[PDB]
Ligand binder design. Structure first.
Ligand SMILES: O=S(=O)(O)O[C@@H]1[C@@H](O)[C@H](O)O[C@H](CO)[C@@H]1O
Ligand SMILES: [Ca+2]
Length: 482
């Protein structure tokens, strides 16, 4: 009968920003109940310390030493204008496209008889590119094609692809009341069409059309709690304007599409309690429709905590254990919350220390849906080598037999010019070609560089960097000396 699978992947949430992982100032009751009926992962990693490559890793089953997308690259900077009211907007939006000759996860599900849904941020390819959801195995899409467009929670348009409405490809749905008002300044909050509510409703309409004939695969890529720090001025926000006193404000960034706002500690806390509430409505709806015993639901985040649009990770991180933010190959930039729930399949109230990353999700779903020897089926014969880097963690997720272990995890990132490797207790961060070494068992906060005492380990972990990194012309890093 094949099981349904939902993956809820949010935007710029830290390892320590949820209650069940140890946040002290924000309520997350729906996700904490999910973990209490679920399995909570303690050593789970993003594909990258930043959005586009992390999402590419998940989609491709490849690490950033091999992947086509290894960073954020914009294709809208020199696009022509289009006017929505008095608002000058970009006529083509989005980021670098996925390689059309390497398979992604939505296309494997389609081959296996699933119907496919995706609600929120795409960030896999610009409008008109070789990689938009219509061409890469998505039946029903609604949200933001472009990472930069997602900066505004009250935008001029959102993107749609709907077989059901007989769209021939991606269109723009114009937000008719928003366009009457500026994009920046005092009058911006006169915009009434809030993106995260409108995108959550479309996801919920899709789900209510589902029944126990065809299996369904859903990607809920909601933008909370990414900047800007603007939302509805309702009860959720007011609870936190109460708890936090005094509070700070944000001056704004017109060039970054982050609007000025007051009570920034209140804004950020409200945005996480709002996302928790959405996840409450998903889990209830699955029970309401008799879907709960045959649906796997996973919650995670695309990278480490942020400091954009008035965010204050220092205040919210008071009791946290990990070093660093988004963009850093330090543990705080890559390690993320990961919760799984499947009544009577995934054991309830469990913690799981298995060392795993987003590039492991492709083989994990393949093993769950019955699709055997996926590499030989989907690998491209016209390539000199078609890399697949993942190991399935389906065994440990069902607490059964034969869990296999990585020799290493690997990450590289251009903006901070860093490389990260984890090999058991040992962790390497290369900065501008110089290796730093830490033991995570004696030093989780990565305070003591012990490269001096451990040269045999340093060379081994360089031997991994040399074997795993391939040329990519679009994104570059400095390798250490041989
Ligand atoms: O989470 S990320 O998408 O990496 O956030 C980044 C954001 O920090 C940066 O300012 O602009 C890019 C645009 O591609 C993304 O929106
Ligand atoms: Ca992100």
């Amino acid at each position: 009968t094949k099981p349904n699978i939902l993956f809820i992947l949010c935007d710029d949430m830290g390892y320590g920003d949820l209650g069940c992982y140890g946040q002290p100032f924000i309520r997350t009751p729906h996700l904490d109940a999910m973990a209490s009926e679920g399995m909570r992962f303690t050593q789970a990693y993003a594909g990258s310390p930043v959005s586009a490559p992390s999402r590419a890793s998940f989609m491709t089953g490849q690490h950033t030493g091999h992947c086509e997308v290894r960073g954020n690259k914009e294709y809208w900077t020199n696009a022509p204008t289009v006017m929505y009211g008095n608002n000058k907007e970009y006529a083509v939006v989005g980021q670098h496209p996925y390689d059309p000759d390497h398979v992604i996860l939505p296309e494997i599900m389609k081959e296996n008889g699933y119907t496919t849904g995706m609600f929120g941020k795409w960030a896999g390819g610009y409008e008109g590119s070789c990689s938009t959801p219509d061409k890469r195995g998505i039946d029903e899409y609604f949200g933001y094609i472009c990472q930069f467009q997602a900066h505004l929670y009250y935008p001029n348009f959102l993107n749609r692809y709907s077989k059901a409405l007989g769209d021939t490809g991606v269109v723009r749905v114009i937000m008719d009341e928003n366009i009457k008002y500026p994009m920046y300044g005092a009058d911006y909050q006169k915009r009434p069409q809030y993106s995260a509510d409108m995108i959550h409703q479309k996801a919920m309409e899709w789900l209510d059309e589902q029944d126990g004939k065809q299996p369904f695969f859903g990607v809920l890529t909601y933008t909370l709690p990414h900047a800007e720090l603007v939302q509805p001025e309702d009860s959720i926000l007011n609870e936190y304007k109460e708890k936090f006193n005094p509070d700070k404000s944000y001056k704004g960034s017109e060039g970054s599409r982050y609007n000025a706002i007051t009570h920034v500690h209140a804004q950020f806390a409200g945005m996480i309690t709002r996302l928790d509430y959405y996840v409450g409505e998903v889990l209830k709806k699955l029970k309401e429709k008799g879907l709960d015993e045959n649906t796997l639901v996973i919650f995670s985040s695309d990278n480490g905590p942020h400091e954009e649009g008035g965010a204050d990770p220092t205040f919210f991180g008071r009791d946290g254990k990990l070093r660093g933010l988004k963009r850093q190959c330090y543990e705080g930039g890559i390690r993320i919350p990961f919760i799984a729930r499947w009544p009577g399949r995934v054991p309830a109230g469990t913690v799981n220390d298995h060392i795993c990353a987003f590039y492991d999700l492709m083989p994990t779903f393949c093993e769950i849906i019955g699709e055997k020897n996926y590499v030989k089926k989907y690998a491209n014969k016209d390539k000199e080598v078609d890399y697949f880097d993942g190991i399935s963690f389906a065994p440990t997720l069902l607490g059964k037999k034969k869990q296999k272990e990585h020799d290493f995890l690997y990450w590289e990132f251009n903006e901070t010019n860093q490389i990260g490797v984890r090999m058991g207790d040992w962790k390497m961060v290369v900065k501008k070609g110089i290796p730093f070494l830490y033991n995570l068992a004696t030093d989780i906060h990565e305070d003591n560089n012990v490269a001096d005492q451990h040269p045999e380990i340093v060379e081994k972990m360089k031997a991994v960097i040399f074997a795993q990194h391939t040329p990519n012309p679009h994104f570059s890093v400095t390798l250490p000396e041989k």
